[PDB]
Amino acid sequence: RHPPVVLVPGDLGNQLEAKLDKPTVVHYLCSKKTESYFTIWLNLELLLPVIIDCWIDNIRLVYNKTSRATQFPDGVDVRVPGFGKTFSLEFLDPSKSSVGSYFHTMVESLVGWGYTRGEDVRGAPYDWRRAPNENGPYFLALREMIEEMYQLYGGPVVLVAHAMGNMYTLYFLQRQPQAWKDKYIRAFVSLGAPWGGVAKTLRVLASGDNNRIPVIGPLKIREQQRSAVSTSWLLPYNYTWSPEKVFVQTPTINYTLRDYRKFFQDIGFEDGWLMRQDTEGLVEATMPPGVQLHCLYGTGVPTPDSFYYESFPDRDPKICFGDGDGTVNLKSALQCQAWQSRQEHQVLLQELPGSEHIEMLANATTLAYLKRVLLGP
Ligand SMILES: *[C@@H]1O[C@H](CO)[C@@H](O)[C@H](O)[C@H]1NC(C)=O
Ligand SMILES: *[C@@H]1O[C@H](CO)[C@@H](O)[C@H](O)[C@H]1NC(C)=O
Ligand SMILES: *[C@@H]1O[C@H](CO)[C@@H](O)[C@H](O)[C@H]1NC(C)=O
Ligand SMILES: *[C@@H]1O[C@H](CO)[C@@H](O)[C@H](O)[C@H]1NC(C)=O
């Protein structure tokens, strides 16, 4: 009898749905109203050039300087479907196209080992545009789901998290009493955790990143990417990187992680600084989760490290690459080492050489490791 499993996805890592009754639109071809919720991520037909402005106008967040919190635009609601199920993390596109295949391979493996979707394997999707401080209801639901699974399946749960989901999970665990964790959590499997931030966030905020949707212009998509609090939350931290490391070079000025205030001024996005101040303290840099932890990190994949702009910030930069999994810098991934001596439960590090950030979820070596955690040797 295997332990129950909860899957926690990363940024862009689950479906999102929206419903509209807007006072105004950015152009005539945008819908003001929808009769039902529709899939806003991932739905390829919404990301065509004509209609991308409509999508941006609906999926952007509004930052309120007074409340220091985000809001949806007027007349837009966004929901997270499939909480407690797996469909919305298995496939990002409900057409089930391979372009959106995310947790599917892993869930198929779990089911082959005797798990049942929605029962002893459940997903914990969330609004990944936000940081954990504005996802309180999610954490309550997660705690309840874990307790339910413990009761139903007769033992403590294994959390398996990918990318930013790891930081969501750490935030959650840092806030639960040790006695609760000792009873209800069997282990935490961390895949590709950006503990110390990722360097590519600088380029995203400055000049946009359209690599996920290449037919769209980077300056257009930048509007949405800046609006997501999670982007500013994952700027490089000084517990991983040197305060003297230059992340952005231009012909006249450098930006290090001690220069974020100037950076946000200079790219014309002052709200980003406020978001960073709101979020930089959320995850305690050094406090370990207090559960058995398996830290899996990819290496040997060129990963954005720093950027040179000939023209700043409205032209794409030249990119300098360092080590990591293609998205998460190796330095960020390695914050676990420090936790080894700071908690009693074991912290196991596992290098995955040549394993790319998303591919690691469907990789046979990753799955073999998970099998050993769940089923024994
Ligand atoms: C910002 O929040 C304050 C207090 O909650 C509220 O008075 C105001 O309506 C908000 N501003 C916007 C533009 O929604
Ligand atoms: C590390 O980061 C924070 C600022 O957000 C601060 O508490 C601490 O003093 C910093 N240390 C530096 C810049 O050396
Ligand atoms: C910016 O970076 C370069 C090193 O790349 C350094 O010489 C220069 O002094 C830095 N800017 C400031 C204000 O120190
Ligand atoms: C899976 O990960 C291993 C290391 O863990 C890596 O060497 C291998 O190339 C990966 N598989 C694929 C298909 O890339």
Curated annotation (Swiss-Prot):
Keywords: Acyltransferase, Disulfide bond, Fatty acid metabolism, Glycoprotein, Hydrolase, Lipid degradation, Lipid metabolism, Lysosome, Membrane, Metal-binding, Secreted, Signal, Transferase, Zinc. GO terms for biological process: ceramide metabolic process; diacylglycerol biosynthetic process; fatty acid catabolic process; glycerophospholipid metabolic process; phosphatidylcholine catabolic process; phosphatidylcholine metabolic process; phosphatidylethanolamine catabolic process; phosphatidylglycerol metabolic process. Coiled coil: none annotated. Disulfide bonds join C30-C54. It comes from the Eukaryota. Changing K200A: No effect on phospholipase activity. Abolishes transacylase activity. Has no effect on association with membranes. Has dual calcium-independent phospholipase and O-acyltransferase activities with a potential role in glycerophospholipid homeostasis and remodeling of acyl groups of lipophilic alcohols present in acidic cellular compartments. Catalyzes hydrolysis of the ester bond of the fatty acyl group attached at sn-1 or sn-2 position of phospholipids (phospholipase A1 or A2 activity) and transfer it to the hydroxyl group at the first carbon of lipophilic alcohols (O-acyltransferase activity). This is Lysosomal phospholipase A and acyltransferase. It comes from Homo sapiens (Human).
